[PDB]
Amino acid sequence: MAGPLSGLRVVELAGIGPGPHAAMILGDLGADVVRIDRPSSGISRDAMLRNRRIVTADLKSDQGLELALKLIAKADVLIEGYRPGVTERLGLGPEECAKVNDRLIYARMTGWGQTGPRSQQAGHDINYISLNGILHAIGRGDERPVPPLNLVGDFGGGSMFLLVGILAALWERQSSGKGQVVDAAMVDGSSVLIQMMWAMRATGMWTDTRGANMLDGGAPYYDTYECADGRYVAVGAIEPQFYAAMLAGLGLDAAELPPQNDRARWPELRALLTEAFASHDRDHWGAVFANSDACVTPVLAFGEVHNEPHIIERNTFYEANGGWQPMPAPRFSRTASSQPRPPAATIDIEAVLTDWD
Amino acid sequence: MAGPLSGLRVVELAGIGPGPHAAMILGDLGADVVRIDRPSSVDSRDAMLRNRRIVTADLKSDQGLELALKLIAKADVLIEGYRPGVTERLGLGPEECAKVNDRLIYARMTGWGQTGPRSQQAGHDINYISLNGILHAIGRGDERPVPPLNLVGDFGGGSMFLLVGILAALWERQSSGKGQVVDAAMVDGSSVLIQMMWAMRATGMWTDTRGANMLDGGAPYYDTYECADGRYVAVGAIEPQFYAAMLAGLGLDAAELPPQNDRARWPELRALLTEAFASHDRDHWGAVFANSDACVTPVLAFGEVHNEPHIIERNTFYEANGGWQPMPAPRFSRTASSQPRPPAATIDIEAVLTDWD
Ligand SMILES: CCCCCCCCCC(=O)SCCNC(=O)CCNC(=O)[C@H](O)C(C)(C)COP(=O)(O)OP(=O)(O)OC[C@H]1O[C@@H](n2cnc3c(N)ncnc32)[C@H](O)[C@@H]1OP(=O)(O)O
Numbered sequence: 001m002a003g004p005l006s007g008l009r010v011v012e013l014a015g016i017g018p019g020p021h022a023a024m025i026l027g028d029l030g031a032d033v034v035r036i037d038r039p040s041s042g043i044s045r046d047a048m049l050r051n052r053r054i055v056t057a058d059l060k061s062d063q064g065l066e067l068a069l070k071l072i073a074k075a076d077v078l079i080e081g082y083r084p085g086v087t088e089r090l091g092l093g094p095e096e097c098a099k100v101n102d103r104l105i106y107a108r109m110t111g112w113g114q115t116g117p118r119s120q121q122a123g124h125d126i127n128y129i130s131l132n133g134i135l136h137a138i139g140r141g142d143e144r145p146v147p148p149l150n151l152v153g154d155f156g157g158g159s160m161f162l163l164v165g166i167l168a169a170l171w172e173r174q175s176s177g178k179g180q181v182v183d184a185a186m187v188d189g190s191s192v193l194i195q196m197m198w199a200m201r202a203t204g205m206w207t208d209t210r211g212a213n214m215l216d217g218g219a220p221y222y223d224t225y226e227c228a229d230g231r232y233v234a235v236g237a238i239e240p241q242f243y244a245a246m247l248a249g250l251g252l253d254a255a256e257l258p259p260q261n262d263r264a265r266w267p268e269l270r271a272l273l274t275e276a277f278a279s280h281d282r283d284h285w286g287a288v289f290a291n292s293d294a295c296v297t298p299v300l301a302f303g304e305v306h307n308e309p310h311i312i313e314r315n316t317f318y319e320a321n322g323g324w325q326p327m328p329a330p331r332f333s334r335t336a337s338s339q340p341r342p343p344a345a346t347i348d349i350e351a352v353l354t355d356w357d
Numbered sequence: 358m359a360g361p362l363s364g365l366r367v368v369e370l371a372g373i374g375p376g377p378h379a380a381m382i383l384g385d386l387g388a389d390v391v392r393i394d395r396p397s398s399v400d401s402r403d404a405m406l407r408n409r410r411i412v413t414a415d416l417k418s419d420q421g422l423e424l425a426l427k428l429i430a431k432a433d434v435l436i437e438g439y440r441p442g443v444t445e446r447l448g449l450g451p452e453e454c455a456k457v458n459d460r461l462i463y464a465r466m467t468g469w470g471q472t473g474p475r476s477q478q479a480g481h482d483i484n485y486i487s488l489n490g491i492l493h494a495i496g497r498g499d500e501r502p503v504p505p506l507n508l509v510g511d512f513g514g515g516s517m518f519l520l521v522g523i524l525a526a527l528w529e530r531q532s533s534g535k536g537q538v539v540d541a542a543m544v545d546g547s548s549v550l551i552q553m554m555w556a557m558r559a560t561g562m563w564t565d566t567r568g569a570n571m572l573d574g575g576a577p578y579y580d581t582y583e584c585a586d587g588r589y590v591a592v593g594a595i596e597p598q599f600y601a602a603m604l605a606g607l608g609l610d611a612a613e614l615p616p617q618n619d620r621a622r623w624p625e626l627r628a629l630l631t632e633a634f635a636s637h638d639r640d641h642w643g644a645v646f647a648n649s650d651a652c653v654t655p656v657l658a659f660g661e662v663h664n665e666p667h668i669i670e671r672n673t674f675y676e677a678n679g680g681w682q683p684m685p686a687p688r689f690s691r692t693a694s695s696q697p698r699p700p701a702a703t704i705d706i707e708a709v710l711t712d713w714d
Pocket residue numbers: 013014015016017018036037038039046057058059060081082083086089090109110111112121122123124125126150154557595
């Protein structure tokens with residue numbers, strides 16, 4: 001198994017959203033990932049289950065439980081993404097696991113956390129980010145907030161903090177001999193993910209008004225613009241020098257414009273930039289600003305990404321199954337990840353135990 | 358120093374965006390983090406620079422270069438986020454560091470990658486997520502894409518993958534006795550962050566049309582709703598049992614609505630939910646649905662977060678310098694993080710070498 005995490009052993013209790021994602025990235029980086037699902041559920045067609053061995057096991061039977069504790073005893077990391085109390089009642093809780101393996105990294109992935117008034121409340125991404133200020137800050141000012149898919153609570157503020165916790169605990173274990181419990185709550189991870197805004201708010205550089213900020217779409221130089229063909233470019237020319245280069249490429253004389261950061265005149269600046277970008281198509285601007293520091297890029301739909309030179313040449317994607325999927329990230333000079341293995345048809349939990357003795 | 362990364366030594370070549378966020382988190386979890394800025398910037402209110410020692414050094418000079426190469430010699434990790442070729446030309450490239458410390462994790466944080474046609478273009482978050490299909494997918498169907506702040510490219514798809522690569526490489530160094538180069542590019546990280554959508558596209562369960570999918574605001578049961586007071590709730594009632602609980606709380610009989618997943622009749626369903634949510638204020642809905650699985654939560658503004666019971670009790674935030682800031686994530690049972698230390702005055706680079714033996 002290729003990658004920096006070769007020989008890491010991971011048991012994943014099947015859930016949804018962050019847990020599977022974290023487990024995927026471990027697999028991607030060459031960890032040995034065994035996913036316990038329930039027998040009620042051919043080859044699974046969710047490519048988020050790549051780089052896994054899938055076993056079934058009724059964890060409510062005494063046999064399925066025992067079989068599971070046998071895996072966990074042979075493993076470095078356990079991931080679970082159920083409401084609190086769930087693993088405990090299965091007899092798979094942190095304390096039961098410590099009995100069969102005091103070295104285990106016990107990784108708990110929730111939205112709301114392990115305790116507290118909301119800890120038994122069902123939820124999805126959109127809910128975890130509603131409570132901590134994040135969702136309110138996203139979208140245009142004249143409109144209701146828009147969910148940034150499930151990228152911020154589940155993955156960015158969720159799976160990724162679970163991973164940072166699993167791997168920091170493994171480092172700590174190198175010196176202590178011992179495992180421990182990682183409590184990764186989406187409401188917490190996503191708040192750290194957005195620490196920059198909390199910092200900026202303290203220094204009066206961010207307001208709670210939606211659509212009135214440097215990075216939320218309010219700044220005319222950090223937003224998308226519609227082009228003559230109805231497609232879009234993104235402009236991100238925060239630095240004055242990059243901003244100047246953008247104006248020149250648009251054909252606009254800086255002298256006739258309001259200042260870049262005179263916020264009172266932003267509506268006026270935006271009207272001028274809107275008219276300029278609308279006068280040619282997306283691909284024209286892509287060509288004009290190639291090799292430039294103007295921070296102007298075409299906004300590609302998923303279906304066009306495979307045709308973009310910079311994407312093709314770094315192999316950010318590989319072809320699979322129905323189509324393209326992202327190659328592992330990040331990349332390693334010496335112990336390079338390899339292409340993911342497709343979702344690996346159900347194997348028998350005994351076989352795995354033989355393999356791991 | 359409290360936390361799982363106690364004893365980890367980190368050298369950070371001062372930059373912007375992901376690199377400082379990654380460095381912040383390492384420090385958050387107990388790492389000993391030393392930040393080399395240029396003296397050209399000598400004065401900090403940026404609470405992203407918490408858990409840090411700051412030092413000055415003209416790396417263009419001979420003395421600067423040598424003092425930096427000494428710190429790097431005595432450290433586990435180097436973080437840099439300059440364009441490719443910068444550290445090489447400065448004499449702090451991977452090869453030069455390898456000659457003074459072959460245990461070093463050499464962590465390279467860019468947007469576009471170390472090579473390829475865009476590898477030298479300036480950019481920010483909005484640029485990196487524009488090329489890989491992400492930005493096009495965010496926002497309402499009848500409007501241009503809206504940036505999800507800088508959450509998806511800088512942090513979730515940037516710093517967080519940097520952290521995972523650093524920590525994965527540290528694990529690997531337990532076997533090999535050798536460091537390596539981590540190449541974290543925001544266009545790759547963010548692509549893995551959205552792997553779900555790439556999977557779902559392959560199986561026909563996600564389209565390239567903005568605002569017409571399950572998780573982008575197109576589903577009436579996964580979206581925000583405006584209330585009587587002009588504030589908002591979030592609805593995330595994906596599973597039919599949670600949807601049913603929401604309907605009951607709204608006072609709508611299932612028998613009068615279209616089916617939850619009859620997409621052709623989503624216009625009607627949205628109209629019905631819209632009218633219902635509009636009939637009371639946010640805080641009313643917050644009360645009705647506390648302790649429910651209805652997946653309905655108030656959309657709070659930053660400024661209101663500190664009064665939410667569940668946030669207070671879990672101490673998701675701490676006070677510092679006229680404003681709240683997030684506590685470290687995730688959480689650790691045995692080697693818990695401590696409250697971050699604020700930015701300090703600059704320290705002498707000699708005194709750091711002295712302290713580090
Ligand atoms: C691909 C297209 C589909 C769309 C994807 C969905 C959207 C993306 C996800 C997000 O946006 S994050 C959303 C999920 N939130 C979390 O994961 C936070 C923590 N988890 C939860 O809050 C709950 O797991 C959740 C609300 C998601 C679902 O609640 P359930 O009540 O279905 O499950 P719960 O976690 O409470 O318990 C699972 C049950 O399965 C049982 N179980 C688990 N594995 C088993 C096994 N192998 N055999 C037998 N039983 C098993 C477990 O024993 C337990 O039984 P109990 O009835 O005794 O409590």
